[PDB]
Amino acid sequence: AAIDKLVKASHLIDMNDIIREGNPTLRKVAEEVTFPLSEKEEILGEKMMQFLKHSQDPIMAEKLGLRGGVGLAAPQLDISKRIIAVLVPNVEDAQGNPPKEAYSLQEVMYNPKVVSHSVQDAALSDGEGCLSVDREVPGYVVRHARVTIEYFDKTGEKHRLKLKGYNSIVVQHEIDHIDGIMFYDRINEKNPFAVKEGLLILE
Ligand code: NI
Ligand code: NI
Ligand code: NI
Ligand code: NI
Ligand code: NI
Ligand code: NI
Ligand code: NI
Ligand code: NI
């Protein structure tokens, strides 16, 4: 399986492991995973994480030739399991000083789900990006402003958590992937930049 390739100890994940628009796996609803987790599912969570670190540190990003990213779902890897990893860095201030906490969210989540949400919608102002997609796709991708979610980590401990702003978008986009939904499915068909009143635009 694709899975055996990805878990070899010496294998680092890169762009050639990411499948593309049209691979039929991108559109399936992913299988739930069970605990305690198999060695491969544990390992895959870390490789996935390690990839997002690698993809965000300026020189590996260069050695491995990666595009910057803040989340990755197992479907993008030809593996149809409910495993997403998220990694959203905080920024430096104007004086160059690193922030307090490195990340606003660093987690590999098993079986993630949205359990409730806000009635208000939000959309990133710069639109959304995807590694399985090589088209420029303009427009606002409309998501819930605020989400509550549960998920398990790799020890099987269950987590409940509320998110807003940008972290909320990113988890939402990753969860969609494990249900076969692509982002452009939430861009308005007639006008891509239509703004329903009250839609929150994050800049
Ligand atoms: Ni590879
Ligand atoms: Ni481990
Ligand atoms: Ni590394
Ligand atoms: Ni500061
Ligand atoms: Ni609902
Ligand atoms: Ni994506
Ligand atoms: Ni619950
Ligand atoms: Ni705990």
Swiss-Prot record:
Its cofactor is Fe(2+). GO terms for biological process: co-translational protein modification; translation. One of its GO terms (molecular function) is peptide deformylase activity. It catalyses: N-terminal N-formyl-L-methionyl-[peptide] + H2O = N-terminal L-methionyl-[peptide] + formate. The active site is at E174. The keyword Iron applies. InterPro entries: Peptide_deformylase, Peptide_deformylase_sf. Its EC number is 3.5.1.88. Keywords: Hydrolase, Iron, Metal-binding, Protein biosynthesis. Removes the formyl group from the N-terminal Met of newly synthesized proteins. Requires at least a dipeptide for an efficient rate of reaction. N-terminal L-methionine is a prerequisite for activity but the enzyme has broad specificity at other positions. PANTHER family: PEPTIDE DEFORMYLASE, PEPTIDE DEFORMYLASE 2. NCBIfam families: pept_deformyl. This is Peptide deformylase. The gene is def.
